[PDB]
Amino acid sequence: MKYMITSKGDEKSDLLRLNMIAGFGEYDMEYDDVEPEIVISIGGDGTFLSAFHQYEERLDEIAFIGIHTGHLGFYADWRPAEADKLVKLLAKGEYQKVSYPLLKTTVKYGKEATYLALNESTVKSSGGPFVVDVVINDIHFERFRGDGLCMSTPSGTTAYNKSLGGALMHPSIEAMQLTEMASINNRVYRTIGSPLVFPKHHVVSLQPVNDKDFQISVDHLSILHRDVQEIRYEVSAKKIHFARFRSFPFWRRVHDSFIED
Amino acid sequence: MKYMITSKGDEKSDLLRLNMIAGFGEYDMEYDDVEPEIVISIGGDGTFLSAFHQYEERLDEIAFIGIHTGHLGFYADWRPAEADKLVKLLAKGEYQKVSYPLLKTTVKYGKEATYLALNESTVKSSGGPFVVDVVINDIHFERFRGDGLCMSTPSGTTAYNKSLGGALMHPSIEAMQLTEMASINNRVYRTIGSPLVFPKHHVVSLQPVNDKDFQISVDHLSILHRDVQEIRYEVSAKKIHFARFRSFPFWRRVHDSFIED
Amino acid sequence: MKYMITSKGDEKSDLLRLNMIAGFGEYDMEYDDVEPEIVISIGGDGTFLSAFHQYEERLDEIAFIGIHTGHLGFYADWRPAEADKLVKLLAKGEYQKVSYPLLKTTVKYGKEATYLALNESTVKSSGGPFVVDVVINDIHFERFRGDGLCMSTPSGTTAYNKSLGGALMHPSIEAMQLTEMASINNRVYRTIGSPLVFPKHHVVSLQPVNDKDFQISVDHLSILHRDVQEIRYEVSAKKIHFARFRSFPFWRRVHDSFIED
Amino acid sequence: MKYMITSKGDEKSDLLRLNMIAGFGEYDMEYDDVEPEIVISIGGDGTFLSAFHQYEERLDEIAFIGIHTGHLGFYADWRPAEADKLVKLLAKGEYQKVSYPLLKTTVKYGKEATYLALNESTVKSSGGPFVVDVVINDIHFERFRGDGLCMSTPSGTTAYNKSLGGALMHPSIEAMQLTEMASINNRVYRTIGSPLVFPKHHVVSLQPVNDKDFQISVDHLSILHRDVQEIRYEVSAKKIHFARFRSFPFWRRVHDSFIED
């Protein structure tokens, strides 16, 4: 059907993209970057993140594919030299689709705004001290003082979450995971410390204690939100779909990225 | 129906048990510690652990209830003074049952043996160096050198898992979590470090590299296994059932145990 | 001799300060906030930090004293009700002086600027990715990618350093300690991870890899430095002096602040 | 003067040792494994540890040297191919000596026994629960419940201490560092968590709460001590001496062992 290709913009990526476009022309494959059904990303995990967000409004009508021109990525897990074999199988079809959970973030003001994260959503302070009350399903759980908090999808657990001490979880688990950034713990101030892993339908809510200005990030983009009253996290009802041509198990991707390849 | 009561054996616990037995006599409640349908545990989490294991062969035909005569427990989350109101509702019935996942451990020799964990199963060395190959769904993931490994149920994540840096996960998630004990990491030796959270049907397998003698624990009991060829972990097909009379959310139990009460 | 008193500015602190000033008047004690020999700080650790920095140019000619009107502080470790007994002993004198090491930070441009930290000096990115080469005594040790780095005095180790996983060290040790904030570690990127504790005369130097704009903090104040070529850390030749009237061991202050009081 | 050589016992090590012995014969170098002044260790850090302990009673009268026939060691930091150049300089002399602090452990009964550690001394339980009161300079600091405690020399901080989260400290710092193994922390039980770094002359003392049987290790050897009343740690008055022929800075050894080589 219809397809498009994003590129990191370096010479490798642009040239591989132009080459793939020519291969597609040799099939009944029409390039449409408006309503594609296949989105190919050429570059790294960042390039793939950008492609996801470019088309987050047609997630149900798209299967994504990642080609890494640099080191192996977690989302771009196909090698540039397999590119021709890829165009081939994309044309004849018959591939299976694989779905990863996403994270929904809602920001309320005194008005609302929602975002969808593939990696994670984080909250920090606009400079001043970061103090937030953490409420779980309307139960006040803790008062967090520190640098910030990170809420991660399953596939995001090998990203920022990992650097904060979070657990890696298999993407077939419909869950989200909360980790702390440098929490203060003394006689006066008390956080759980451990990461927290939440199931579908649980709502984690952050509420300001003094300052109501926070730097909120969603994947690679950071927005300053003024006069904030609440930040709601929950596992999204929407999912991202991957075109899969081949067995490449998550734990193998983990081993290849972190242990040895 | 039929019921039984275990006690920690201190005076508080024995006396509360004898008192509850008298209250049950005032209903059509017959004490049977052979095929009970209700198992009451009076004491702490250890006492409850012992009660689970005493009756692990009739898990489908039993609902458990925990009374803590000391500090609040995670499994024994009812207070001693609510004991009379408890006997009451146990008799009239109409309570709901709540189910937590369990962990299945298989130990192979050169013969087999399986165990069921409510908290966690751990592996350490019989003194010598602990070196094990970790295989995930038949894929060699890492060679672990260190003090040992811990595999935890969801409800076990607030126990040993927590002290090892693991994430706390809500018990409605059918999963198991692997954490490291003091792994060596240098130029030569490489582990993931992060905890790992596995879904149902995944099989984590530990295989010896030199020494084949390990100290294996399952909840509060530690068995020395000689001439071991494999230790298989997976989320069990069996589940533990709790009689629930009242809303006491897991995250509240967490907040009460660790943040403040 | 000459003395001055800073206050947090709340009613407790101002009133205690005015009361102490009256007690001093009853001795040969002259209030001079220009060249004091005794600096009293009334409030919390922040108030004390501000007092240290107000007079960092006469550190050799001053003995500091902290009064906490809130919870116990690490620098303000005297209780408000002992205030009269304090004025007493300050007048008759004969107290001993205690000295804690400080941290020297030098920032070079393309010009120079040095700062003195009592708690710690940190470095983060002006938004973009934080990538810095870490050089120890001119030997390239690691390329750090992550949120930032923290360099701590001994007395600072119970502050930000503690929240980052650093070790607590007794203030009689002339050293500084470097900790990581969320470092990325994968096949491509490699940091030591462990905190590092440096002796006197060692020079840790941070050098930019791409972006040369960093947010640099020294205790409670954060400065944006543009066109930065180097940040040099070393244990300072200058030390802070405390008037001591009483044995209050560091490890007891630690136990009281973090374990129980 | 007099010298001796230990070997790991594999063919590489034995053959290199016999070769070095022949080179020494070509000088006024007499082999004496009773009162040597130079102790050469051929193998790995374990082999070197064994050599230190073989001669711990003549530490003031010996300079140690490590040759690694496997990967680089922290104590055996000379390569096998530099062996001839080594025998050379050992004969003509004029080398400088470098000294690392050691750890003194005293075990009291109801009688006494002291040990000297180059890496670290650890304490665990004989199976039952490990509960110990930690007293610092006679001040009760904390009640530790968990798997055990580790007390490390500076040069030991890259060994077991490192795997437990401890800080790496430069060996010129006369100090010792205490780290926790899986401590329980909840409403009831409270430890500091952070590693602790102690200066010379401080005494950390462990005292039993119930069980008085512990597995105590000193470097590579583990002794079961029954009816124990106290374990005292302090920085030793004795130091280990290294023959140094060449600049090989500690932080470079760290970088080479852990970052890349």
Ligand SMILES: CC(=O)NCCCN(CC#Cc1nc2c(N)ncnc2n1[C@@H]1O[C@H](CO)[C@@H](O)[C@H]1O)C[C@H]1O[C@@H](n2cnc3c(N)ncnc32)[C@H](O)[C@@H]1O
């Ligand atoms: C300041 C800065 O770094 N700007 C962001 C530029 C990169 N991007 C793109 C990416 C990605 C990605 N996605 C994945 C993935 N899903 N799984 C595994 N690796 C992945 N990666 C790998 O992350 C490594 C570091 O760029 C690269 O090698 C990628 O292969 C934003 C993502 O950065 C993550 N992050 C931000 N502060 C972090 C920190 N302090 N520590 C660790 N992670 C951090 C965050 O997650 C965000 O979503």
Ligand SMILES: CC(=O)NCCCN(CC#Cc1nc2c(N)ncnc2n1[C@@H]1O[C@H](CO)[C@@H](O)[C@H]1O)C[C@H]1O[C@@H](n2cnc3c(N)ncnc32)[C@H](O)[C@@H]1O
């Ligand atoms: C040597 C020794 O301790 N012998 C075991 C005696 C206790 N038992 C009974 C229990 C329990 C329990 N079950 C739960 C639960 N599910 N959730 C939360 N708390 C719970 N608890 C609480 O654990 C605290 C410590 O006893 C108590 O206060 C309980 O309220 C064995 C259980 O000990 C756990 N463990 C063993 N080494 C540990 C360590 N180093 N660190 C932390 N945990 C450790 C392990 O899990 C085992 O399954």
Ligand SMILES: CC(=O)NCCCN(CC#Cc1nc2c(N)ncnc2n1[C@@H]1O[C@H](CO)[C@@H](O)[C@H]1O)C[C@H]1O[C@@H](n2cnc3c(N)ncnc32)[C@H](O)[C@@H]1O
């Ligand atoms: C954003 C923000 O917090 N603004 C700073 C306002 C406070 N100030 C004053 C203080 C202090 C202090 N000095 C000591 C001391 N020497 N020892 C022990 N406690 C101490 N305290 C205690 O720190 C607790 C938290 O304010 C209070 O309870 C004090 O009793 C700046 C100091 O904040 C430290 N910090 C900054 N991000 C931190 C983090 N994420 N985590 C932990 N620490 C962090 C940093 O060290 C700086 O130097």
Ligand SMILES: CC(=O)NCCCN(CC#Cc1nc2c(N)ncnc2n1[C@@H]1O[C@H](CO)[C@@H](O)[C@H]1O)C[C@H]1O[C@@H](n2cnc3c(N)ncnc32)[C@H](O)[C@@H]1O
């Ligand atoms: C059960 C077992 O392992 N038996 C001990 C056999 C090894 N020996 C010899 C050694 C050594 C050594 N000394 C140094 C040194 N000073 N600096 C850096 N590396 C060093 N190494 C390196 O340690 C790596 C692991 O053998 C090797 O690669 C060596 O190059 C005992 C030493 O093991 C240490 N340990 C014990 N449980 C540990 C754990 N769980 N995690 C990390 N460390 C652990 C402990 O320190 C003891 O003192």
